[PDB]
Amino acid sequence: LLVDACYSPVERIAYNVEAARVEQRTDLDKLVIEMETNGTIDPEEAIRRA
Amino acid sequence: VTEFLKPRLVDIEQVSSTHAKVTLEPLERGFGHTLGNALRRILLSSMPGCAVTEVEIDGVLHEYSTKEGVQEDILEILLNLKGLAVRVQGKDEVILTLNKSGIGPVTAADITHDGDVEIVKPQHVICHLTDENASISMRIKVQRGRGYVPASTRIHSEEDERPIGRLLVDACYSPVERIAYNVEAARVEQRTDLDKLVIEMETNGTIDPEEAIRRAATILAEQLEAFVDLRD
Amino acid sequence: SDEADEAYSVTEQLTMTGINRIRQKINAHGIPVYLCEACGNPIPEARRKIFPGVTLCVECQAYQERQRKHYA
Amino acid sequence: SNKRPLKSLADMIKGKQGRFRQNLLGKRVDYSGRSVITVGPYLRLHQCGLPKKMALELFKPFIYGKLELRGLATTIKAAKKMVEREEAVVWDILDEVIREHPVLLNRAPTLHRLGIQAFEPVLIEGKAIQLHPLVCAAYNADFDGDQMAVHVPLTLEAQ
Amino acid sequence: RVTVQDAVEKIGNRFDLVLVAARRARQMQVGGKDPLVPEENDKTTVIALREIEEGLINNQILDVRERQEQQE
Ligand SMILES: [Mg+2]
Ligand SMILES: [Zn+2]
C-alpha cells in the first residue's frame, strides 16, 4: 500500500508569454506566471524559492 | 533534501578554431535540460560581437554600382564584408582601413591592423581585383553590439547627417552560430543519477567558449536576481 | 478555399454522378425473361448469364443503341 | 469621336455605370484601408492586430485632437507636423485613442453579415492585419494572401 | 468590454440599448457630465454601457434627469 508522492508543494504551474512595448521596442516580452501550491508555501514563496 | 551539487565546467575542447565543446559535470536530476536549454537560448540570443557596420569606398556613391577593375558589384562587396570576423580588444568600435592594388583576390589579410583588432580568418576573401592597375581602399567600420541591427532601424533619422558615399551594412553581432547540448549520466562513485552537460557551441572565432558560458550564466543570474525578491 | 479545393469538389461530383449513372444502367439483379421483348427470339444463354435480366437480344439492343445515340 | 455611342441622361442614370447602381449604394469611403491578413493566434475573439501605420493613418483626426487637447501640440498644424515626423508621443496618443474603438473588418464577397465584424484594434508592427483564427469561417478567409478592408466608426452611435 | 449581454438584459432590446448608451455617452463626452460608475480609463462608450449594466442608466432615468435639469 505505497502511494505516489508529490513532495513539491506546487499543484500546478503554467506560464504564458505576451507582448510588451517599452517606448519604442515593441518586440519586448511579458511573463505571466500562474501557480497554485498545496499550502505548505504560498505561490510567491515557491516562485522565489525556485 | 540534503542539497544540490552545483555544476562546474570541467573542461573546454577547442576541437576546431570555432567549434568547441564545453562540459558542466555535476548536475542534479532534472537540471541538465533546465541549464542546457536556458544556456542555449541565452547564447543564441545575447552575445556581444564586432559586426562591421559601415563601409566607405573611395570612388563609390551607392551600393548599386561597379568599381572599374574589381569584379564585384559594391552590393556583393558589402555582402562579403558582412561575415568578416573581427575581434577588437579595447574599444567599442574601430575603423579598419583596407588598401589593395594589383591582379588578385583581396582577402582579409589585406587590412592594416591597429593591434587592438584581430581578424580571426585572414583568408576570408572580400573582393577580386581583376586589373593590372586597379586599386581599391575602404574604411571599414567595425563596432561591438549584440543581436541584429539592420541599417534601416539603425538610421532612425540619423546621428546628425551622413555623407553621400557611406554605406551601412546590416550588422549581426553574434559570435555563435550553433548550440547543441547533450545531457548524459556521469560516472561518479558517489551518486549514479548525476549527469553532465555537454555544450557544442559553434562560434565564428571571436568568442572564447568559457567566456561565452560565463557571460550566459551572468545574463541569466541577473534576471534570476530580478526574480528572487518580489515586490511589485 | 484555395480555388483548387472547390475545383476538387466540382470534379468529385462530376465523376461520381457519371459513375453512378453508368452503374444504374446495368440493372444486374432482375428477371429471367428468356425471350426478346422486341422479336421474341431466344436470348441466348450466355447473354442472360452475363447480364441477368436483359430484355433485348444483341441485335435489337445494338439497334436501340444507334437510335439513342442520335437522340429521341 | 469613336465607334461607341454617346452616353445620355437616361444612360447617366441607368446601367451599372449609372447613378443608382454604383454611385448611390456602392461608394468609396474615407477613414478606411486594406491590407494583407495573417494569423495572430494569440489574440482574443474581440480583437484584431492593426498595423501601427494603418492605425496612424485612419485615426489621424482623433490623434490631432488629442495632441492639441493635451497641449502636446499647440495648433492643428503643429500636431500635423508631430504625427508626420512620427515622434515619441504620437505613439502614446495612438494607444490612448485606439483603446476602446472598434474597427470593422470586411472581406470582399460579403455573402452574409458576418463578412463584417467590429474588432478592437491591437497595435502591431509590420503591415499585415492579424485576424483571429476562429473568425475565418465567417469571413471565408484563408491566410494564403487574402486581404481585408478596415473601416473606422466615427460617431459615438457607430462606436 | 467584450459581451454586452448584461447591458442588453437590463434594457431588453439591442437597438434601444445602443441608442440609450449613445445618448448617455454623448452627455458624458461632449455635453459634460460625471460617470455614475468609476471609469477605469474607459471611453464614454464603455462607461455608458457599464452604467447601463448596473442599472444606473436607462431611458426613463435619463428623461427624468433631463426634467430635473430643467428644474435647475
Ligand atoms: Mg485565399
Ligand atoms: Zn431480339
XYZ file of C-alpha atoms and ligand atoms in Angstrom:
587
model
C 0.000 0.000 0.000
C 2.510 2.593 -1.207
C 1.261 5.886 -2.599
C 2.580 8.280 -5.211
C 4.499 11.112 -3.572
C 4.253 14.685 -4.832
C 6.775 16.281 -2.494
C 6.920 19.504 -4.476
C 4.434 21.985 -2.963
C 3.202 23.135 -6.388
C -0.060 21.560 -7.502
C 0.025 23.324 -10.862
C 2.145 25.946 -12.558
C 1.629 27.349 -16.009
C 3.214 30.380 -17.597
C 2.044 32.399 -20.567
C 4.101 34.879 -22.534
C 2.577 38.005 -24.028
C 3.811 41.135 -25.755
C 5.120 44.367 -24.248
C 6.471 47.608 -25.719
C 8.649 49.867 -23.607
C 8.702 53.091 -25.585
C 9.958 52.049 -28.993
C 10.991 48.409 -28.596
C 7.683 46.674 -29.200
C 9.337 43.268 -29.607
C 9.627 43.038 -25.824
C 8.227 40.277 -23.641
C 5.794 39.971 -20.723
C 5.842 36.968 -18.430
C 2.570 35.954 -16.797
C 3.311 33.088 -14.344
C 0.297 31.448 -12.700
C 0.736 28.935 -9.927
C -1.107 27.211 -7.116
C 0.515 25.379 -4.225
C -0.879 22.775 -1.858
C -0.491 25.030 1.198
C 2.989 24.479 2.591
C 4.090 27.719 0.893
C 2.143 30.492 -0.801
C 2.672 30.927 -4.556
C 5.060 33.875 -4.307
C 7.199 31.875 -1.903
C 7.513 28.849 -4.167
C 8.362 31.105 -7.104
C 11.239 32.827 -5.341
C 12.450 29.544 -3.843
C 12.764 28.037 -7.315
C 16.651 17.199 0.551
C 20.309 17.276 1.561
C 21.385 19.647 -1.210
C 22.084 20.108 -4.910
C 25.573 19.617 -6.260
C 26.366 22.803 -8.130
C 27.693 22.258 -11.661
C 31.127 23.458 -12.709
C 32.854 23.420 -16.076
C 35.414 20.629 -16.013
C 36.957 21.245 -19.423
C 36.655 23.022 -22.756
C 37.617 21.382 -26.049
C 38.688 23.553 -28.984
C 38.194 20.707 -31.436
C 38.367 23.374 -34.140
C 39.215 27.062 -34.180
C 35.498 27.856 -33.934
C 33.800 24.621 -32.869
C 34.045 23.994 -29.126
C 32.514 21.553 -26.634
C 32.399 22.629 -23.016
C 31.262 20.394 -20.164
C 29.457 21.096 -16.879
C 29.922 17.925 -14.917
C 27.879 17.509 -11.728
C 24.207 18.272 -12.371
C 21.338 17.074 -10.223
C 18.476 15.171 -11.808
C 16.431 17.472 -13.997
C 18.936 20.313 -14.291
C 20.700 19.131 -17.414
C 17.819 20.273 -19.575
C 16.982 23.326 -17.476
C 20.513 24.700 -17.650
C 21.057 23.463 -21.180
C 18.004 24.996 -22.772
C 18.393 28.258 -20.875
C 22.067 28.419 -21.799
C 21.443 27.686 -25.468
C 18.784 30.351 -25.626
C 20.924 32.999 -23.945
C 23.931 32.111 -26.101
C 21.983 32.055 -29.360
C 20.360 35.346 -28.393
C 22.548 37.679 -26.371
C 26.234 37.521 -27.185
C 28.386 40.559 -27.953
C 30.054 40.886 -31.314
C 32.045 43.124 -33.585
C 29.902 43.483 -36.661
C 31.197 45.633 -39.465
C 28.656 48.433 -39.594
C 29.663 50.715 -42.460
C 31.979 50.859 -45.417
C 33.245 53.937 -47.212
C 34.865 53.022 -50.515
C 36.865 55.535 -52.495
C 35.038 56.444 -55.671
C 31.660 54.872 -54.883
C 28.350 56.601 -54.182
C 25.777 53.855 -53.583
C 25.873 50.098 -53.204
C 24.380 49.589 -56.669
C 27.450 50.448 -58.720
C 30.616 48.915 -60.124
C 34.212 49.888 -59.427
C 36.383 49.775 -62.524
C 38.650 46.783 -62.223
C 37.199 44.889 -59.246
C 34.813 42.234 -60.482
C 32.211 42.511 -57.738
C 29.307 44.889 -57.519
C 29.525 47.075 -54.450
C 26.429 45.229 -53.251
C 28.348 41.961 -53.286
C 31.434 43.514 -51.704
C 29.294 44.713 -48.813
C 27.759 41.250 -48.502
C 31.278 39.817 -48.293
C 32.184 42.385 -45.658
C 29.199 41.344 -43.543
C 30.610 37.988 -42.460
C 34.050 39.442 -41.739
C 35.019 38.050 -38.336
C 36.862 40.676 -36.316
C 37.597 40.811 -32.599
C 38.535 44.223 -31.205
C 40.408 44.293 -27.919
C 39.926 47.732 -26.436
C 37.238 49.935 -27.959
C 33.560 49.512 -28.704
C 34.239 50.496 -32.315
C 37.157 50.941 -34.675
C 37.802 51.983 -38.262
C 39.818 49.443 -40.210
C 41.480 50.607 -43.415
C 41.874 48.226 -46.353
C 44.203 49.290 -49.171
C 44.980 46.963 -52.061
C 46.061 47.078 -55.696
C 47.036 44.630 -58.411
C 45.650 41.487 -60.003
C 44.412 39.086 -57.362
C 41.976 38.290 -54.582
C 41.537 40.740 -51.709
C 41.418 38.670 -48.541
C 41.019 39.982 -45.015
C 44.801 39.811 -44.719
C 44.952 42.993 -46.804
C 43.621 45.125 -43.946
C 46.076 47.001 -41.767
C 45.796 46.090 -38.083
C 45.518 48.559 -35.236
C 46.833 45.903 -32.884
C 43.642 46.176 -30.853
C 41.859 44.365 -33.679
C 42.333 40.704 -34.563
C 40.909 39.322 -37.793
C 40.374 35.675 -36.965
C 40.002 34.483 -40.560
C 42.590 36.329 -42.692
C 41.824 34.100 -45.691
C 38.249 35.398 -45.925
C 38.087 36.906 -49.413
C 36.494 40.326 -49.806
C 36.807 41.221 -53.488
C 38.827 40.379 -56.602
C 40.997 42.959 -58.299
C 40.888 41.792 -61.904
C 43.029 44.574 -63.365
C 46.792 45.001 -63.514
C 46.349 48.634 -62.471
C 43.139 48.686 -60.423
C 43.326 49.741 -56.784
C 40.714 49.853 -54.027
C 40.622 51.206 -50.494
C 37.925 51.099 -47.836
C 37.359 52.447 -44.357
C 35.529 49.539 -42.781
C 33.818 50.438 -39.523
C 33.733 47.564 -37.071
C 31.802 48.027 -33.865
C 30.632 45.953 -30.945
C 26.974 45.331 -30.275
C 24.551 42.483 -29.761
C 21.727 40.954 -31.758
C 20.849 42.141 -35.252
C 20.568 45.830 -36.096
C 19.653 46.339 -39.751
C 20.784 49.580 -41.318
C 17.158 50.676 -41.611
C 16.445 50.627 -37.885
C 19.987 51.911 -37.419
C 19.126 55.012 -39.436
C 16.213 56.298 -37.364
C 16.697 59.732 -38.808
C 20.481 59.964 -38.476
C 23.150 60.920 -35.998
C 23.212 64.416 -37.479
C 23.794 63.845 -41.214
C 25.544 61.138 -43.225
C 27.668 61.909 -46.314
C 26.711 60.502 -49.688
C 29.349 57.814 -50.029
C 28.932 55.945 -46.721
C 27.245 52.561 -46.946
C 25.527 50.915 -43.983
C 25.911 47.154 -43.932
C 23.492 45.079 -41.873
C 25.027 44.322 -38.508
C 24.771 40.880 -36.894
C 26.682 40.918 -33.609
C 26.605 37.323 -32.673
C 29.673 35.122 -32.409
C 27.662 31.901 -32.071
C 26.035 30.080 -34.969
C 25.131 26.789 -33.343
C 24.472 25.415 -29.889
C 23.746 21.772 -29.218
C 23.682 20.346 -25.726
C 23.663 16.718 -24.630
C 22.907 15.685 -21.063
C 24.316 12.303 -20.109
C 24.859 10.251 -16.974
C 28.204 10.947 -15.315
C 30.224 8.054 -13.906
C 30.616 9.202 -10.294
C 31.344 6.826 -7.426
C 29.231 8.891 -5.026
C 25.899 9.046 -6.888
C 24.680 7.401 -10.082
C 21.788 9.663 -11.058
C 24.049 12.676 -11.632
C 24.515 13.831 -15.209
C 26.929 16.071 -17.079
C 26.023 18.689 -19.663
C 27.997 18.966 -22.895
C 27.576 22.127 -24.940
C 28.739 22.172 -28.544
C 28.882 25.867 -29.305
C 29.883 26.957 -32.789
C 31.229 30.481 -32.624
C 32.724 32.258 -35.605
C 36.101 32.523 -33.854
C 35.573 35.723 -31.867
C 34.226 34.326 -28.593
C 36.017 32.078 -26.163
C 33.705 29.250 -25.083
C 34.499 29.739 -21.409
C 33.778 33.437 -21.704
C 30.617 32.611 -23.644
C 29.289 30.319 -20.917
C 30.312 32.713 -18.153
C 28.555 35.587 -19.900
C 25.460 33.446 -20.380
C 25.352 32.385 -16.740
C 25.770 36.019 -15.744
C 22.954 37.194 -18.019
C 20.740 34.506 -16.535
C 21.610 35.109 -12.887
C 20.913 38.803 -13.437
C 17.290 38.118 -14.369
C 17.024 35.496 -11.651
C 18.081 38.200 -9.201
C 15.295 40.338 -10.631
C 13.044 37.359 -9.831
C 14.360 36.322 -6.413
C 12.560 39.020 -4.450
C 9.104 40.383 -5.247
C 7.979 43.173 -4.856
C 5.532 44.694 -7.338
C -10.869 27.588 -50.127
C -7.682 27.991 -52.183
C -9.663 27.904 -55.502
C -8.480 24.339 -56.150
C -10.392 22.799 -53.249
C -13.695 23.937 -54.692
C -12.482 22.687 -58.056
C -11.872 19.373 -56.357
C -15.433 19.242 -55.069
C -16.769 20.038 -58.553
C -14.701 17.298 -60.165
C -15.712 14.824 -57.469
C -19.404 15.490 -58.030
C -18.985 15.263 -61.806
C -17.190 11.913 -61.786
C -19.446 10.411 -59.121
C -22.662 11.351 -60.896
C -21.286 9.934 -64.142
C -20.111 6.713 -62.480
C -23.435 6.107 -60.825
C -25.455 6.826 -63.948
C -23.393 4.281 -65.882
C -23.815 1.900 -62.964
C -27.603 2.262 -62.752
C -27.801 1.451 -66.448
C -26.596 -2.085 -65.680
C -29.601 -3.378 -63.627
C -27.782 -6.589 -62.685
C -30.469 -8.084 -60.438
C -33.512 -8.935 -62.495
C -35.970 -11.357 -64.025
C -35.219 -14.441 -66.155
C -37.150 -13.166 -69.207
C -35.792 -15.898 -71.547
C -37.161 -14.287 -74.734
C -36.655 -10.985 -76.546
C -39.201 -8.229 -75.966
C -38.577 -6.943 -79.494
C -38.522 -10.029 -81.720
C -39.411 -12.763 -79.219
C -36.197 -14.524 -80.212
C -34.293 -16.776 -77.823
C -31.955 -14.536 -75.887
C -29.009 -16.981 -75.861
C -27.904 -18.447 -72.547
C -24.596 -16.612 -72.353
C -26.212 -13.202 -72.686
C -28.559 -13.951 -69.788
C -25.662 -15.258 -67.708
C -23.582 -12.146 -68.388
C -26.471 -9.696 -67.939
C -29.085 -11.195 -65.623
C -32.300 -9.524 -66.659
C -31.797 -8.483 -70.275
C -34.841 -7.550 -72.318
C -33.342 -7.396 -75.822
C -31.136 -9.664 -77.852
C -27.850 -8.203 -79.020
C -29.302 -7.227 -82.396
C -32.265 -5.266 -81.036
C -30.040 -3.839 -78.313
C -27.480 -2.516 -80.788
C -30.315 -1.197 -82.936
C -31.746 0.739 -79.999
C -28.248 1.960 -79.151
C -27.888 3.529 -82.589
C -31.129 5.489 -82.255
C -30.460 6.574 -78.684
C -27.032 7.575 -79.948
C -28.526 10.177 -82.235
C -31.403 11.084 -79.922
C -35.116 10.588 -79.379
C -15.168 60.619 -81.944
C -15.167 56.838 -81.583
C -17.168 53.806 -82.643
C -19.197 53.693 -79.457
C -22.454 55.519 -78.752
C -22.553 58.637 -76.671
C -23.841 58.443 -73.123
C -27.032 60.349 -72.378
C -29.264 61.310 -69.481
C -31.144 58.014 -69.404
C -27.727 56.385 -69.616
C -26.444 58.727 -66.916
C -28.985 57.233 -64.519
C -29.463 53.629 -65.670
C -26.923 50.865 -66.178
C -24.311 49.659 -63.700
C -22.292 52.682 -64.797
C -25.393 54.688 -63.853
C -26.066 56.612 -60.686
C -28.352 54.122 -58.942
C -26.129 51.060 -59.379
C -22.660 52.024 -58.139
C -22.808 55.681 -57.112
C -25.979 55.568 -54.991
C -25.086 52.440 -52.999
C -21.510 51.464 -53.804
C -19.349 54.396 -52.795
C -15.709 54.917 -51.973
C -15.315 55.636 -48.294
C -12.788 57.573 -46.222
C -11.192 56.573 -42.933
C -10.569 53.167 -44.412
C -7.872 50.984 -45.815
C -6.910 47.444 -46.632
C -4.024 45.148 -46.037
C -2.992 41.505 -46.117
C -4.260 39.378 -43.257
C -2.129 36.997 -41.194
C -2.944 34.712 -38.274
C -2.082 36.299 -34.962
C -3.139 33.249 -32.960
C -2.696 34.900 -29.563
C -5.498 37.442 -29.919
C -8.886 37.056 -28.334
C -12.124 36.810 -30.250
C -12.752 40.534 -29.852
C -9.509 41.967 -31.229
C -7.546 42.295 -34.455
C -3.926 43.250 -34.960
C -3.958 46.612 -36.681
C -0.611 47.746 -38.083
C 0.759 50.874 -36.469
C 0.930 52.612 -39.824
C -2.635 51.924 -40.904
C -3.770 52.857 -37.406
C -1.839 56.120 -37.536
C -3.393 56.951 -40.902
C -7.038 56.094 -40.199
C -7.136 57.675 -36.731
C -5.479 60.876 -37.899
C -8.133 63.441 -36.847
C -8.580 61.734 -33.495
C -4.834 61.938 -32.903
C -4.692 65.590 -33.931
C -7.459 66.332 -31.474
C -5.604 64.502 -28.734
C -2.294 66.276 -29.292
C -3.982 69.655 -29.227
C -6.124 68.695 -26.226
C -3.219 67.520 -24.057
C -1.141 70.520 -25.089
C 1.442 68.324 -26.804
C 0.691 70.288 -29.991
C -0.100 73.990 -29.913
C -2.298 74.092 -33.012
C -3.505 71.548 -35.532
C -0.562 72.388 -37.797
C 1.901 71.569 -35.029
C 0.100 68.295 -34.390
C 0.197 67.591 -38.111
C 3.955 68.020 -38.109
C 4.312 65.895 -34.969
C 2.438 62.945 -36.404
C 4.189 63.483 -39.727
C 7.569 63.065 -38.059
C 6.002 60.219 -36.039
C 7.504 61.445 -32.793
C 7.515 59.622 -29.472
C 4.205 60.910 -28.098
C 2.136 60.191 -31.195
C 2.536 56.555 -30.186
C 1.200 57.060 -26.678
C -1.643 59.058 -28.174
C -2.293 56.171 -30.556
C -2.538 53.728 -27.674
C -4.953 56.032 -25.886
C -7.138 56.833 -28.894
C -7.411 53.243 -30.115
C -8.148 51.881 -26.654
C -11.865 51.148 -26.901
C -12.587 51.934 -30.510
C -13.651 49.086 -32.783
C -12.656 48.734 -36.420
C -14.856 46.985 -38.961
C -13.089 44.164 -40.782
C -14.671 43.241 -44.102
C -13.710 40.828 -46.844
C -14.728 41.290 -50.433
C -17.547 38.780 -51.050
C -19.839 39.776 -48.184
C -22.158 36.822 -48.647
C -23.679 37.381 -45.199
C -23.434 39.865 -42.367
C -20.511 38.039 -40.845
C -18.336 39.379 -43.520
C -18.216 42.488 -41.368
C -17.285 42.438 -37.734
C -16.140 45.033 -35.227
C -12.859 44.162 -33.522
C -10.834 46.029 -31.044
C -7.547 47.099 -32.593
C -4.370 45.798 -31.037
C -1.441 47.742 -32.430
C 1.219 45.587 -34.061
C 4.411 46.026 -36.015
C 4.526 45.225 -39.689
C 1.908 45.892 -42.310
C -0.356 42.832 -42.193
C -3.685 42.746 -40.393
C -3.763 39.937 -37.849
C -7.105 38.143 -37.918
C -8.297 35.707 -35.255
C -8.299 32.043 -36.332
C -11.863 31.243 -35.248
C -13.191 34.089 -37.435
C -12.012 32.762 -40.790
C -15.074 30.536 -41.143
C -17.340 33.570 -41.011
C -15.059 35.536 -43.302
C -14.285 32.626 -45.654
C -10.680 33.761 -45.334
C -7.559 31.648 -45.509
C -4.127 33.107 -44.867
C -2.642 32.468 -48.308
C -2.792 36.078 -49.444
C -6.341 37.271 -48.868
C -6.829 40.902 -47.914
C -9.173 42.709 -45.570
C -10.576 46.214 -45.535
C -10.769 48.018 -42.207
C -13.185 50.880 -41.717
C -13.266 53.148 -38.686
C -16.568 54.006 -36.954
C -16.574 57.763 -36.457
C -19.569 58.571 -34.295
C -20.425 57.566 -30.765
C -23.521 55.945 -32.208
C -21.463 53.955 -34.690
C -18.963 53.072 -31.979
C -15.973 45.424 -22.656
C -16.416 42.153 -24.529
C -20.028 40.969 -24.373
C -22.881 43.373 -23.754
C -25.304 40.681 -22.594
C -25.996 42.237 -19.192
C -26.494 45.722 -20.629
C -28.893 44.195 -23.143
C -30.745 42.304 -20.412
C -31.279 45.456 -18.348
C -32.850 47.336 -21.251
C -34.429 44.414 -23.095
C -33.568 45.430 -26.629
C -30.458 45.642 -28.730
C -31.149 48.760 -30.800
C -32.651 50.737 -27.923
C -29.605 49.767 -25.862
C -27.317 51.243 -28.498
C -29.399 54.419 -28.522
C -29.501 54.819 -24.725
C -25.773 54.186 -24.389
C -25.049 56.623 -27.226
C -27.066 59.459 -25.726
C -25.613 58.932 -22.251
C -22.108 58.759 -23.693
C -22.752 61.981 -25.580
C -23.792 63.610 -22.326
C -20.652 62.238 -20.702
C -18.289 63.179 -23.522
C -19.357 66.459 -25.108
C -22.163 67.915 -23.025
C -20.042 67.118 -19.981
C -21.169 65.025 -17.025
C -19.720 62.712 -14.398
C -19.752 58.931 -14.867
C -22.128 57.379 -12.354
C -19.706 54.440 -12.350
C -15.944 54.552 -11.653
C -14.291 54.892 -15.057
C -11.134 52.786 -15.256
C -9.720 54.910 -18.074
C -12.538 53.844 -20.395
C -14.037 55.775 -23.272
C -17.516 57.222 -22.819
C -18.901 54.289 -24.816
C -17.786 51.596 -22.378
C -18.618 53.817 -19.406
C -22.165 54.264 -20.683
C -22.600 50.543 -21.329
C -21.211 49.587 -17.912
C -23.526 52.124 -16.297
C -26.461 50.525 -18.089
C -25.277 47.218 -16.626
C -25.505 48.436 -13.019
C -28.993 49.853 -13.598
C -27.729 53.403 -13.069
C -28.714 54.376 -16.612
C -31.708 53.832 -18.878
C -34.100 55.968 -20.897
C -36.522 56.574 -18.030
C -33.712 57.690 -15.717
C -32.250 59.905 -18.447
C -35.501 61.696 -19.241
C -36.119 62.120 -15.505
C -32.693 63.712 -15.152
C -33.491 65.980 -18.092
C -36.613 67.075 -16.221
C -34.533 67.726 -13.091
C -32.036 69.675 -15.206
C -34.822 71.918 -16.456
C -35.921 72.376 -12.850
C -32.382 73.648 -12.306
Mg -7.099 32.886 -50.245
Zn -34.205 -9.783 -80.026
